[model samples]
Target: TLPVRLCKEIELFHFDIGPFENMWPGIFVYMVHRSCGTSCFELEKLCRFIMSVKKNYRRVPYHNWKHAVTVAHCMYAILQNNHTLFTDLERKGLLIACLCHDLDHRGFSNSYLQKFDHPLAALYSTSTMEQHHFSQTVSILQLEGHNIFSTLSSSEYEQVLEIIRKAIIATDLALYFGNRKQLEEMYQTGSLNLNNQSHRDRVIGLMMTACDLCSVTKLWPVTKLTANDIYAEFWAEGDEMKKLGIQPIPMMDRDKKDEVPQGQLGFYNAVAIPCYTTLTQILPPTEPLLKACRDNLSQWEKVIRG
Candidate 1:
Protein backbone atom coordinates (compact mmCIF):
# COMPACT_ATOMS: atom_id res chain seq x y z
CA THR A 1 0.00 0.00 0.00
CA LEU A 2 1.28 3.47 -0.91
CA PRO A 3 1.62 5.99 1.89
CA VAL A 4 -1.05 8.60 2.49
CA ARG A 5 1.68 11.23 2.12
CA LEU A 6 2.75 10.00 -1.33
CA CYS A 7 -0.84 9.52 -2.43
CA LYS A 8 -1.52 13.14 -1.49
CA GLU A 9 1.36 14.06 -3.77
CA ILE A 10 -0.45 12.43 -6.70
CA GLU A 11 -3.58 14.44 -5.96
CA LEU A 12 -1.57 17.64 -5.69
CA PHE A 13 0.34 17.05 -8.91
CA HIS A 14 -2.61 15.78 -10.93
CA PHE A 15 -2.81 18.86 -13.05
CA ASP A 16 0.92 19.35 -13.49
CA ILE A 17 2.76 16.05 -13.73
CA GLY A 18 5.70 17.73 -15.45
CA PRO A 19 8.27 17.15 -12.67
CA PHE A 20 7.17 13.67 -11.63
CA GLU A 21 7.91 11.23 -14.41
CA ASN A 22 8.61 8.28 -12.10
CA MET A 23 5.46 8.98 -10.08
CA TRP A 24 3.27 8.12 -13.08
CA PRO A 25 3.10 4.44 -12.19
CA GLY A 26 2.41 5.13 -8.52
CA ILE A 27 -0.39 7.48 -9.37
CA PHE A 28 -2.14 5.15 -11.83
CA VAL A 29 -1.60 2.07 -9.67
CA TYR A 30 -3.22 3.77 -6.73
CA MET A 31 -6.15 4.95 -8.85
CA VAL A 32 -6.91 1.41 -10.02
CA HIS A 33 -6.15 -0.31 -6.74
CA ARG A 34 -8.21 1.93 -4.47
CA SER A 35 -10.98 2.33 -6.97
CA CYS A 36 -11.39 -1.38 -7.65
CA GLY A 37 -10.56 -2.70 -4.16
CA THR A 38 -8.35 -5.07 -6.10
CA SER A 39 -5.29 -6.19 -4.11
CA CYS A 40 -3.00 -5.88 -7.07
CA PHE A 41 -0.16 -4.97 -4.69
CA GLU A 42 3.10 -4.54 -6.46
CA LEU A 43 3.77 -0.89 -7.01
CA GLU A 44 7.21 -2.03 -8.13
CA LYS A 45 5.69 -4.27 -10.75
CA LEU A 46 3.46 -1.47 -11.97
CA CYS A 47 6.48 0.82 -12.23
CA ARG A 48 8.27 -1.84 -14.23
CA PHE A 49 5.24 -2.12 -16.47
CA ILE A 50 5.09 1.61 -17.16
CA MET A 51 8.84 1.70 -17.82
CA SER A 52 8.52 -1.17 -20.24
CA VAL A 53 5.64 0.48 -22.06
CA LYS A 54 7.52 3.78 -22.18
CA LYS A 55 10.51 2.12 -23.81
CA ASN A 56 8.28 0.78 -26.57
CA TYR A 57 7.09 4.26 -27.57
CA ARG A 58 9.04 5.85 -30.40
CA ARG A 59 10.75 9.12 -29.50
CA VAL A 60 8.30 11.06 -31.65
CA PRO A 61 7.96 14.74 -30.82
CA TYR A 62 4.37 14.45 -29.64
CA HIS A 63 3.16 10.88 -29.16
CA ASN A 64 5.91 9.73 -26.82
CA TRP A 65 5.86 8.95 -23.10
CA LYS A 66 5.53 12.60 -22.10
CA HIS A 67 2.26 12.96 -23.99
CA ALA A 68 1.04 9.59 -22.73
CA VAL A 69 1.51 10.58 -19.08
CA THR A 70 -0.16 13.91 -19.68
CA VAL A 71 -3.18 12.23 -21.24
CA ALA A 72 -3.51 9.93 -18.25
CA HIS A 73 -3.22 12.93 -15.97
CA CYS A 74 -6.00 14.63 -17.86
CA MET A 75 -8.21 11.56 -17.37
CA TYR A 76 -7.34 11.56 -13.69
CA ALA A 77 -8.55 15.13 -13.36
CA ILE A 78 -11.73 14.36 -15.28
CA LEU A 79 -12.44 11.35 -13.12
CA GLN A 80 -11.69 13.17 -9.89
CA ASN A 81 -14.04 15.98 -10.79
CA ASN A 82 -16.78 13.55 -11.77
CA HIS A 83 -15.90 10.87 -9.25
CA THR A 84 -19.41 9.80 -8.39
CA LEU A 85 -20.45 9.24 -11.98
CA PHE A 86 -18.24 6.28 -12.90
CA THR A 87 -17.91 2.83 -11.39
CA ASP A 88 -14.52 1.68 -10.12
CA LEU A 89 -14.15 -0.78 -12.97
CA GLU A 90 -14.87 2.00 -15.45
CA ARG A 91 -12.30 4.19 -13.75
CA LYS A 92 -9.58 1.55 -13.95
CA GLY A 93 -10.22 0.94 -17.63
CA LEU A 94 -10.30 4.66 -18.33
CA LEU A 95 -6.91 5.36 -16.74
CA ILE A 96 -5.09 2.32 -18.11
CA ALA A 97 -6.49 2.89 -21.59
CA CYS A 98 -5.47 6.53 -21.39
CA LEU A 99 -1.89 5.59 -20.56
CA CYS A 100 -1.68 2.95 -23.26
CA HIS A 101 -3.68 4.77 -25.97
CA ASP A 102 -0.83 6.03 -28.09
CA LEU A 103 1.65 3.28 -27.39
CA ASP A 104 4.10 2.52 -30.21
CA HIS A 105 2.79 5.22 -32.51
CA ARG A 106 5.11 5.69 -35.45
CA GLY A 107 3.98 9.34 -35.57
CA PHE A 108 1.93 8.70 -38.67
CA SER A 109 -1.83 8.58 -39.27
CA ASN A 110 -3.67 5.65 -40.86
CA SER A 111 -3.92 7.35 -44.21
CA TYR A 112 -0.20 7.88 -44.38
CA LEU A 113 0.38 4.25 -43.54
CA GLN A 114 -2.10 2.98 -46.12
CA LYS A 115 -0.82 5.26 -48.86
CA PHE A 116 2.66 4.01 -48.25
CA ASP A 117 1.66 0.34 -47.91
CA HIS A 118 3.09 0.19 -44.41
CA PRO A 119 2.78 -3.29 -42.89
CA LEU A 120 0.66 -1.96 -40.00
CA ALA A 121 -1.82 -0.72 -42.57
CA ALA A 122 -2.06 -4.23 -43.86
CA LEU A 123 -2.50 -5.61 -40.36
CA TYR A 124 -5.39 -3.28 -39.45
CA SER A 125 -7.14 -2.08 -42.58
CA THR A 126 -8.80 0.54 -40.42
CA SER A 127 -7.73 2.14 -37.15
CA THR A 128 -4.21 0.96 -37.84
CA MET A 129 -2.37 2.84 -35.08
CA GLU A 130 -5.06 2.24 -32.45
CA GLN A 131 -4.92 -1.50 -33.13
CA HIS A 132 -1.15 -1.52 -32.80
CA HIS A 133 -1.38 0.32 -29.47
CA PHE A 134 -3.61 -2.46 -28.11
CA SER A 135 -1.22 -5.03 -29.45
CA GLN A 136 1.58 -3.28 -27.58
CA THR A 137 -0.57 -3.17 -24.42
CA VAL A 138 -1.02 -6.95 -24.47
CA SER A 139 2.66 -7.49 -25.23
CA ILE A 140 3.74 -5.41 -22.23
CA LEU A 141 1.25 -7.15 -19.92
CA GLN A 142 2.86 -10.48 -20.77
CA LEU A 143 6.47 -9.35 -20.23
CA GLU A 144 8.18 -11.33 -17.41
CA GLY A 145 8.46 -8.67 -14.72
CA HIS A 146 5.87 -6.26 -16.11
CA ASN A 147 2.69 -8.23 -15.55
CA ILE A 148 1.20 -5.62 -13.29
CA PHE A 149 -2.26 -7.13 -13.45
CA SER A 150 -1.07 -10.61 -12.43
CA THR A 151 -2.98 -10.50 -9.19
CA LEU A 152 -6.28 -9.69 -10.79
CA SER A 153 -8.65 -12.63 -10.94
CA SER A 154 -9.08 -14.20 -14.36
CA SER A 155 -12.44 -12.46 -14.76
CA GLU A 156 -11.14 -9.04 -13.68
CA TYR A 157 -8.13 -9.36 -15.95
CA GLU A 158 -10.24 -10.22 -18.96
CA GLN A 159 -12.71 -7.44 -18.19
CA VAL A 160 -9.91 -4.87 -17.83
CA LEU A 161 -8.35 -5.96 -21.12
CA GLU A 162 -11.72 -5.71 -22.89
CA ILE A 163 -12.26 -2.20 -21.59
CA ILE A 164 -8.75 -1.29 -22.64
CA ARG A 165 -9.39 -2.48 -26.18
CA LYS A 166 -12.61 -0.49 -26.57
CA ALA A 167 -11.27 2.61 -24.87
CA ILE A 168 -8.04 2.62 -26.88
CA ILE A 169 -9.61 2.00 -30.28
CA ALA A 170 -11.96 4.90 -29.56
CA THR A 171 -8.93 7.20 -29.70
CA ASP A 172 -9.05 6.88 -33.43
CA LEU A 173 -10.40 10.29 -34.41
CA ALA A 174 -12.47 8.74 -37.18
CA LEU A 175 -14.07 6.43 -34.66
CA TYR A 176 -14.34 9.28 -32.18
CA PHE A 177 -16.45 11.16 -34.67
CA GLY A 178 -18.84 8.26 -34.94
CA ASN A 179 -19.07 7.68 -31.19
CA ARG A 180 -19.44 11.39 -30.52
CA LYS A 181 -22.31 11.56 -33.00
CA GLN A 182 -24.08 8.57 -31.56
CA LEU A 183 -23.63 9.87 -28.02
CA GLU A 184 -24.84 13.30 -29.05
CA GLU A 185 -27.99 11.91 -30.56
CA MET A 186 -28.63 9.86 -27.47
CA TYR A 187 -28.16 12.87 -25.21
CA GLN A 188 -30.36 15.12 -27.30
CA THR A 189 -33.03 12.46 -27.34
CA GLY A 190 -32.66 12.06 -23.58
CA SER A 191 -31.55 8.43 -23.61
CA LEU A 192 -27.95 8.55 -22.45
CA ASN A 193 -27.28 7.33 -18.91
CA LEU A 194 -23.86 7.03 -17.33
CA ASN A 195 -24.95 4.37 -14.85
CA ASN A 196 -26.58 2.06 -17.36
CA GLN A 197 -24.60 -1.06 -18.18
CA SER A 198 -25.19 -0.87 -21.94
CA HIS A 199 -23.89 2.69 -22.25
CA ARG A 200 -20.91 2.08 -20.00
CA ASP A 201 -18.35 1.59 -22.74
CA ARG A 202 -19.72 4.48 -24.81
CA VAL A 203 -19.38 6.87 -21.92
CA ILE A 204 -15.93 5.53 -21.11
CA GLY A 205 -14.83 5.68 -24.72
CA LEU A 206 -15.98 9.28 -25.16
CA MET A 207 -14.21 10.24 -21.99
CA MET A 208 -11.10 8.65 -23.42
CA THR A 209 -11.60 10.71 -26.59
CA ALA A 210 -11.94 13.85 -24.50
CA CYS A 211 -8.62 13.22 -22.76
CA ASP A 212 -6.83 12.01 -25.87
CA LEU A 213 -7.34 15.49 -27.34
CA CYS A 214 -7.81 17.27 -24.05
CA SER A 215 -5.12 19.77 -24.99
CA VAL A 216 -7.58 21.74 -27.10
CA THR A 217 -9.67 22.40 -24.02
CA LYS A 218 -6.78 23.65 -21.90
CA LEU A 219 -5.60 27.20 -21.25
CA TRP A 220 -4.35 29.08 -24.29
CA PRO A 221 -0.65 28.44 -23.79
CA VAL A 222 -1.10 24.81 -22.86
CA THR A 223 -3.37 24.30 -25.82
CA LYS A 224 -0.91 26.03 -28.14
CA LEU A 225 2.02 24.01 -26.81
CA THR A 226 0.16 20.76 -27.32
CA ALA A 227 -0.84 21.77 -30.84
CA ASN A 228 2.74 22.60 -31.66
CA ASP A 229 3.91 19.26 -30.33
CA ILE A 230 1.35 17.31 -32.38
CA TYR A 231 2.06 19.34 -35.51
CA ALA A 232 5.77 18.91 -34.99
CA GLU A 233 5.10 15.21 -35.33
CA PHE A 234 2.87 15.94 -38.27
CA TRP A 235 5.52 18.06 -39.95
CA ALA A 236 8.07 15.33 -39.41
CA GLU A 237 5.73 12.80 -41.02
CA GLY A 238 5.22 15.23 -43.87
CA ASP A 239 8.96 15.38 -44.31
CA GLU A 240 8.94 11.62 -44.57
CA MET A 241 6.21 11.82 -47.20
CA LYS A 242 8.28 14.28 -49.23
CA LYS A 243 11.34 12.04 -49.03
CA LEU A 244 9.21 9.24 -50.39
CA GLY A 245 8.07 11.38 -53.36
CA ILE A 246 4.59 11.79 -51.89
CA GLN A 247 2.93 15.19 -51.56
CA PRO A 248 2.21 16.13 -47.97
CA ILE A 249 -1.23 17.36 -46.97
CA PRO A 250 -1.43 21.03 -46.12
CA MET A 251 -1.98 20.32 -42.41
CA MET A 252 1.28 18.38 -42.29
CA ASP A 253 3.20 20.66 -44.62
CA ARG A 254 5.64 23.04 -42.98
CA ASP A 255 5.89 24.94 -46.24
CA LYS A 256 2.28 26.06 -45.83
CA LYS A 257 2.69 27.27 -42.28
CA ASP A 258 0.62 30.36 -43.02
CA GLU A 259 -2.53 28.23 -42.96
CA VAL A 260 -2.39 27.76 -39.19
CA PRO A 261 -5.37 29.98 -38.43
CA GLN A 262 -7.73 28.44 -40.96
CA GLY A 263 -6.55 24.94 -40.16
CA GLN A 264 -7.12 25.41 -36.44
CA LEU A 265 -10.44 27.08 -37.07
CA GLY A 266 -11.67 24.11 -39.08
CA PHE A 267 -10.42 21.68 -36.46
CA TYR A 268 -12.20 23.49 -33.63
CA ASN A 269 -15.43 23.85 -35.53
CA ALA A 270 -15.40 20.39 -37.02
CA VAL A 271 -13.93 18.31 -34.21
CA ALA A 272 -13.15 20.06 -30.93
CA ILE A 273 -16.25 22.20 -30.65
CA PRO A 274 -18.80 19.46 -31.33
CA CYS A 275 -16.98 16.81 -29.31
CA TYR A 276 -16.56 18.98 -26.21
CA THR A 277 -19.98 20.55 -26.58
CA THR A 278 -21.79 17.20 -26.66
CA LEU A 279 -19.55 15.88 -23.90
CA THR A 280 -20.49 18.70 -21.54
CA GLN A 281 -24.11 17.80 -22.11
CA ILE A 282 -23.38 14.54 -20.28
CA LEU A 283 -20.56 15.59 -17.93
CA PRO A 284 -21.42 19.08 -16.82
CA PRO A 285 -18.18 19.33 -14.87
CA THR A 286 -16.45 19.45 -18.23
CA GLU A 287 -18.23 22.66 -19.17
CA PRO A 288 -15.03 24.58 -18.63
CA LEU A 289 -13.39 22.69 -21.48
CA LEU A 290 -16.19 23.83 -23.72
CA LYS A 291 -15.58 27.39 -22.63
CA ALA A 292 -11.88 26.98 -23.29
CA CYS A 293 -12.57 25.65 -26.76
CA ARG A 294 -14.75 28.65 -27.52
CA ASP A 295 -12.06 30.95 -26.12
CA ASN A 296 -9.48 29.34 -28.41
CA LEU A 297 -11.66 29.78 -31.44
CA SER A 298 -11.92 33.47 -30.56
CA GLN A 299 -8.14 33.70 -30.42
CA TRP A 300 -7.87 32.05 -33.80
CA GLU A 301 -10.26 34.63 -35.17
CA LYS A 302 -7.78 37.35 -34.22
CA VAL A 303 -4.96 35.45 -35.88
CA ILE A 304 -6.95 35.12 -39.08
CA ARG A 305 -7.68 38.85 -39.12
CA GLY A 306 -4.12 39.81 -38.23
Candidate 2:
Protein backbone atom coordinates (compact mmCIF):
# COMPACT_ATOMS: atom_id res chain seq x y z
CA THR A 1 0.00 0.00 0.00
CA LEU A 2 1.11 3.55 -0.63
CA PRO A 3 2.19 5.53 2.44
CA VAL A 4 -0.45 7.75 4.05
CA ARG A 5 1.32 10.87 2.81
CA LEU A 6 1.62 9.52 -0.74
CA CYS A 7 -1.97 8.28 -0.74
CA LYS A 8 -3.17 11.71 0.25
CA GLU A 9 -0.96 13.65 -2.14
CA ILE A 10 -1.48 11.47 -5.22
CA GLU A 11 -5.01 12.73 -5.70
CA LEU A 12 -4.18 16.42 -5.54
CA PHE A 13 -3.63 18.51 -8.66
CA HIS A 14 -1.37 20.84 -6.71
CA PHE A 15 0.91 18.21 -5.16
CA ASP A 16 4.36 19.64 -4.56
CA ILE A 17 6.62 16.71 -5.37
CA GLY A 18 9.77 18.70 -6.04
CA PRO A 19 11.26 17.93 -2.63
CA PHE A 20 10.80 14.17 -3.00
CA GLU A 21 13.20 13.62 -5.85
CA ASN A 22 15.06 10.71 -4.27
CA MET A 23 11.85 8.99 -3.22
CA TRP A 24 10.25 8.98 -6.69
CA PRO A 25 11.22 5.44 -7.70
CA GLY A 26 9.82 4.05 -4.44
CA ILE A 27 6.68 6.08 -4.96
CA PHE A 28 6.27 4.65 -8.45
CA VAL A 29 6.88 1.12 -7.18
CA TYR A 30 4.28 1.46 -4.45
CA MET A 31 1.72 2.96 -6.83
CA VAL A 32 1.70 -0.21 -8.95
CA HIS A 33 2.72 -2.70 -6.28
CA ARG A 34 -0.80 -4.01 -5.73
CA SER A 35 -1.64 -4.57 -9.39
CA CYS A 36 1.86 -5.70 -10.42
CA GLY A 37 3.22 -7.68 -7.56
CA THR A 38 6.45 -9.60 -7.38
CA SER A 39 4.87 -12.56 -9.15
CA CYS A 40 3.63 -10.43 -12.03
CA PHE A 41 6.55 -8.04 -12.36
CA GLU A 42 9.87 -8.47 -10.60
CA LEU A 43 9.99 -5.56 -8.18
CA GLU A 44 13.73 -5.19 -8.57
CA LYS A 45 13.59 -4.87 -12.34
CA LEU A 46 10.74 -2.40 -12.21
CA CYS A 47 12.68 -0.17 -9.85
CA ARG A 48 15.72 -0.37 -12.07
CA PHE A 49 13.65 0.36 -15.14
CA ILE A 50 12.13 3.41 -13.50
CA MET A 51 15.53 4.64 -12.36
CA SER A 52 16.92 4.16 -15.85
CA VAL A 53 13.99 6.05 -17.28
CA LYS A 54 14.71 8.85 -14.87
CA LYS A 55 18.37 8.82 -15.84
CA ASN A 56 17.51 9.14 -19.51
CA TYR A 57 15.61 12.39 -19.13
CA ARG A 58 17.84 15.43 -19.62
CA ARG A 59 17.97 18.20 -17.04
CA VAL A 60 15.82 20.38 -19.20
CA PRO A 61 13.94 23.30 -17.68
CA TYR A 62 10.50 21.76 -18.29
CA HIS A 63 10.59 18.16 -19.59
CA ASN A 64 12.86 16.80 -16.90
CA TRP A 65 12.44 13.80 -14.59
CA LYS A 66 10.25 15.87 -12.29
CA HIS A 67 7.86 16.56 -15.13
CA ALA A 68 7.79 12.86 -16.02
CA VAL A 69 6.96 11.85 -12.48
CA THR A 70 4.26 14.53 -12.28
CA VAL A 71 2.69 13.26 -15.50
CA ALA A 72 2.74 9.69 -14.20
CA HIS A 73 1.15 10.88 -10.97
CA CYS A 74 -1.64 12.44 -13.02
CA MET A 75 -2.16 9.12 -14.80
CA TYR A 76 -2.30 7.35 -11.46
CA ALA A 77 -5.03 9.74 -10.34
CA ILE A 78 -6.94 9.22 -13.57
CA LEU A 79 -6.66 5.46 -13.30
CA GLN A 80 -7.86 5.53 -9.71
CA ASN A 81 -10.97 7.47 -10.72
CA ASN A 82 -11.82 5.19 -13.67
CA HIS A 83 -10.51 1.81 -12.58
CA THR A 84 -12.97 -0.29 -14.51
CA LEU A 85 -12.67 1.61 -17.77
CA PHE A 86 -9.19 0.29 -18.58
CA THR A 87 -7.78 -3.20 -18.18
CA ASP A 88 -4.90 -3.94 -15.82
CA LEU A 89 -2.59 -4.11 -18.82
CA GLU A 90 -3.75 -0.77 -20.20
CA ARG A 91 -3.33 0.85 -16.81
CA LYS A 92 0.18 -0.53 -16.50
CA GLY A 93 1.12 0.73 -19.95
CA LEU A 94 -0.39 4.15 -19.35
CA LEU A 95 1.54 4.71 -16.14
CA ILE A 96 4.80 3.39 -17.54
CA ALA A 97 4.44 5.33 -20.76
CA CYS A 98 3.71 8.52 -18.89
CA LEU A 99 6.94 8.14 -16.96
CA CYS A 100 8.99 7.36 -20.05
CA HIS A 101 7.27 9.49 -22.69
CA ASP A 102 9.72 12.39 -22.66
CA LEU A 103 12.89 10.39 -22.23
CA ASP A 104 16.00 12.22 -23.48
CA HIS A 105 14.19 15.44 -24.34
CA ARG A 106 16.82 17.93 -25.53
CA GLY A 107 14.98 21.02 -24.30
CA PHE A 108 13.78 21.77 -27.82
CA SER A 109 10.57 21.21 -29.72
CA ASN A 110 10.25 18.64 -32.50
CA SER A 111 10.05 21.39 -35.12
CA TYR A 112 13.32 22.82 -33.84
CA LEU A 113 14.93 19.40 -34.05
CA GLN A 114 13.74 19.11 -37.65
CA LYS A 115 14.82 22.59 -38.53
CA PHE A 116 18.27 22.02 -37.06
CA ASP A 117 18.57 18.72 -38.95
CA HIS A 118 19.56 17.01 -35.73
CA PRO A 119 20.36 13.32 -35.98
CA LEU A 120 17.11 12.40 -34.29
CA ALA A 121 15.22 14.22 -37.04
CA ALA A 122 16.90 12.14 -39.74
CA LEU A 123 16.10 8.92 -37.90
CA TYR A 124 12.45 9.85 -37.54
CA SER A 125 11.01 12.20 -40.14
CA THR A 126 7.68 12.48 -38.29
CA SER A 127 7.05 12.99 -34.60
CA THR A 128 10.81 13.15 -34.45
CA MET A 129 11.43 13.51 -30.71
CA GLU A 130 8.49 11.30 -29.74
CA GLN A 131 9.72 8.43 -31.89
CA HIS A 132 13.15 8.90 -30.36
CA HIS A 133 11.63 8.77 -26.90
CA PHE A 134 9.88 5.50 -27.73
CA SER A 135 13.08 4.08 -29.14
CA GLN A 136 14.94 5.12 -25.98
CA THR A 137 12.27 3.41 -23.89
CA VAL A 138 12.79 0.21 -25.88
CA SER A 139 16.51 0.53 -25.38
CA ILE A 140 16.00 0.75 -21.64
CA LEU A 141 13.84 -2.38 -21.72
CA GLN A 142 16.61 -4.24 -23.46
CA LEU A 143 19.17 -3.36 -20.83
CA GLU A 144 19.99 -6.05 -18.24
CA GLY A 145 18.08 -5.66 -14.95
CA HIS A 146 15.59 -3.39 -16.76
CA ASN A 147 13.16 -5.85 -18.28
CA ILE A 148 10.25 -5.30 -15.91
CA PHE A 149 7.79 -7.02 -18.21
CA SER A 150 9.85 -10.21 -18.30
CA THR A 151 7.18 -12.19 -16.47
CA LEU A 152 4.48 -11.42 -19.01
CA SER A 153 3.62 -13.80 -21.82
CA SER A 154 4.97 -13.00 -25.30
CA SER A 155 1.60 -11.78 -26.62
CA GLU A 156 0.86 -9.70 -23.55
CA TYR A 157 4.28 -8.10 -23.73
CA GLU A 158 3.68 -7.07 -27.34
CA GLN A 159 0.29 -5.59 -26.54
CA VAL A 160 1.68 -3.61 -23.61
CA LEU A 161 4.55 -2.35 -25.74
CA GLU A 162 2.16 -1.24 -28.45
CA ILE A 163 0.08 0.59 -25.88
CA ILE A 164 3.19 2.26 -24.51
CA ARG A 165 4.27 3.30 -28.00
CA LYS A 166 0.95 4.83 -28.97
CA ALA A 167 0.46 6.55 -25.63
CA ILE A 168 3.91 8.10 -25.87
CA ILE A 169 3.55 9.21 -29.46
CA ALA A 170 0.25 10.83 -28.60
CA THR A 171 2.09 13.13 -26.14
CA ASP A 172 3.36 15.01 -29.14
CA LEU A 173 1.02 18.01 -29.23
CA ALA A 174 1.32 18.04 -33.01
CA LEU A 175 -0.99 15.02 -33.05
CA TYR A 176 -3.35 16.36 -30.40
CA PHE A 177 -5.37 18.60 -32.75
CA GLY A 178 -6.32 15.71 -35.01
CA ASN A 179 -6.94 13.35 -32.10
CA ARG A 180 -9.13 15.88 -30.31
CA LYS A 181 -11.13 16.50 -33.48
CA GLN A 182 -11.69 12.77 -34.05
CA LEU A 183 -12.63 12.18 -30.44
CA GLU A 184 -14.98 15.17 -30.57
CA GLU A 185 -16.78 13.66 -33.56
CA MET A 186 -17.40 10.43 -31.67
CA TYR A 187 -18.37 12.30 -28.53
CA GLN A 188 -20.78 14.72 -30.28
CA THR A 189 -22.46 11.90 -32.21
CA GLY A 190 -22.91 9.85 -29.01
CA SER A 191 -20.92 7.04 -30.61
CA LEU A 192 -18.10 6.74 -28.13
CA ASN A 193 -17.96 3.22 -26.73
CA LEU A 194 -15.14 2.13 -24.46
CA ASN A 195 -15.56 -1.34 -25.91
CA ASN A 196 -14.71 -0.03 -29.37
CA GLN A 197 -10.96 -0.22 -29.94
CA SER A 198 -10.82 2.92 -32.08
CA HIS A 199 -12.69 4.98 -29.50
CA ARG A 200 -10.58 3.58 -26.69
CA ASP A 201 -7.41 4.43 -28.57
CA ARG A 202 -8.57 8.00 -29.00
CA VAL A 203 -9.42 8.18 -25.34
CA ILE A 204 -5.95 6.93 -24.50
CA GLY A 205 -4.47 9.65 -26.68
CA LEU A 206 -6.65 12.30 -25.07
CA MET A 207 -5.86 11.05 -21.59
CA MET A 208 -2.13 11.14 -22.32
CA THR A 209 -2.40 14.72 -23.51
CA ALA A 210 -4.44 15.60 -20.47
CA CYS A 211 -1.84 14.17 -18.15
CA ASP A 212 0.99 15.79 -20.09
CA LEU A 213 -0.52 19.25 -19.82
CA CYS A 214 -1.88 18.94 -16.28
CA SER A 215 0.58 21.49 -14.89
CA VAL A 216 -1.93 24.13 -15.88
CA THR A 217 -4.43 22.57 -13.49
CA LYS A 218 -2.25 23.07 -10.43
CA LEU A 219 -2.51 25.94 -7.97
CA TRP A 220 -1.54 29.36 -9.22
CA PRO A 221 1.93 29.37 -7.61
CA VAL A 222 2.83 26.05 -9.20
CA THR A 223 1.22 27.05 -12.50
CA LYS A 224 3.30 30.21 -12.64
CA LEU A 225 6.51 28.29 -11.90
CA THR A 226 5.79 25.71 -14.57
CA ALA A 227 4.95 28.43 -17.08
CA ASN A 228 8.30 30.08 -16.37
CA ASP A 229 10.11 26.77 -16.67
CA ILE A 230 8.48 26.09 -20.03
CA TYR A 231 9.42 29.53 -21.30
CA ALA A 232 12.98 29.07 -20.09
CA GLU A 233 13.31 26.02 -22.34
CA PHE A 234 11.47 27.69 -25.20
CA TRP A 235 13.65 30.77 -24.98
CA ALA A 236 16.80 28.66 -24.93
CA GLU A 237 15.68 26.95 -28.09
CA GLY A 238 14.82 30.30 -29.61
CA ASP A 239 18.28 31.63 -28.77
CA GLU A 240 19.84 28.66 -30.50
CA MET A 241 17.62 29.17 -33.55
CA LYS A 242 18.64 32.81 -33.77
CA LYS A 243 22.28 31.80 -33.83
CA LEU A 244 21.41 29.73 -36.90
CA GLY A 245 19.67 32.66 -38.59
CA ILE A 246 16.09 31.59 -37.80
CA GLN A 247 13.56 33.70 -35.96
CA PRO A 248 11.50 31.89 -33.37
CA ILE A 249 7.74 32.19 -33.27
CA PRO A 250 6.39 34.96 -31.04
CA MET A 251 5.80 32.80 -27.99
CA MET A 252 9.31 31.39 -28.14
CA ASP A 253 11.06 34.68 -28.76
CA ARG A 254 12.60 36.26 -25.69
CA ASP A 255 12.13 39.74 -27.14
CA LYS A 256 8.37 39.19 -26.90
CA LYS A 257 8.45 38.40 -23.19
CA ASP A 258 5.83 41.01 -22.44
CA GLU A 259 3.32 38.97 -24.44
CA VAL A 260 3.57 36.02 -22.05
CA PRO A 261 0.43 36.95 -20.14
CA GLN A 262 -1.60 37.21 -23.32
CA GLY A 263 0.03 34.03 -24.67
CA GLN A 264 -0.90 32.13 -21.51
CA LEU A 265 -4.40 33.59 -21.71
CA GLY A 266 -4.73 32.38 -25.29
CA PHE A 267 -3.27 28.94 -24.45
CA TYR A 268 -5.68 28.30 -21.60
CA ASN A 269 -8.67 29.38 -23.66
CA ALA A 270 -7.73 27.55 -26.85
CA VAL A 271 -5.82 24.49 -25.65
CA ALA A 272 -5.89 23.64 -21.94
CA ILE A 273 -9.51 24.60 -21.23
CA PRO A 274 -10.99 22.82 -24.24
CA CYS A 275 -8.90 19.72 -23.63
CA TYR A 276 -9.96 19.46 -20.00
CA THR A 277 -13.58 20.37 -20.77
CA THR A 278 -13.94 17.44 -23.16
CA LEU A 279 -12.11 15.15 -20.74
CA THR A 280 -14.42 16.12 -17.89
CA GLN A 281 -17.44 15.25 -20.04
CA ILE A 282 -16.08 11.76 -20.64
CA LEU A 283 -14.71 11.27 -17.12
CA PRO A 284 -16.51 13.54 -14.74
CA PRO A 285 -13.97 13.04 -11.99
CA THR A 286 -11.53 15.03 -14.10
CA GLU A 287 -13.63 18.17 -13.71
CA PRO A 288 -11.15 19.57 -11.19
CA LEU A 289 -8.61 19.99 -13.97
CA LEU A 290 -11.05 22.04 -16.02
CA LYS A 291 -11.91 24.17 -13.02
CA ALA A 292 -8.29 24.84 -12.20
CA CYS A 293 -7.60 25.68 -15.81
CA ARG A 294 -10.29 28.35 -15.66
CA ASP A 295 -8.83 29.64 -12.44
CA ASN A 296 -5.40 29.86 -14.04
CA LEU A 297 -6.91 31.63 -17.02
CA SER A 298 -8.39 34.27 -14.76
CA GLN A 299 -5.06 34.70 -13.05
CA TRP A 300 -3.42 35.27 -16.43
CA GLU A 301 -6.22 37.59 -17.42
CA LYS A 302 -5.42 39.61 -14.31
CA VAL A 303 -1.76 39.56 -15.23
CA ILE A 304 -2.36 41.07 -18.66
CA ARG A 305 -4.46 43.87 -17.19
CA GLY A 306 -1.92 44.80 -14.53
Q: Which stretches of candidate 2 lie over 4 Å from their true place?
A: 1-3, 34-40
Residue pairs clashing, model 2: none
Q: Would you estimate the TM-scores of all the predictions?
A: 0.89, 0.96
Please, what are the lDDT tens digits per residue for candidate 1 over residues 146-238?
876677788988888888899999888888888889898898899987667658787777888778777776667767767888889999889
TM-score of 1: 0.89
Best by TM-score: 2
Worst 10 residues of 1 by lDDT: 9-18
lDDT of each: 0.79, 0.86
Model 2: how far is 120 from its true place, Å?
A: 1.5
Tens digits of per-residue lDDT, candidate 2, 1-306, equal 446866777667656566687777777776676444545577678878988898898989999998998888888878878877888899898899999999999998888878878899899999998998899999999999898778789999999999999999999898998888787888899998989987888899999999999899888998898898999999998899889888989888999999999999998888888788889888888788888889989999999999
Would you give me the overall lDDT of model 1? 0.79
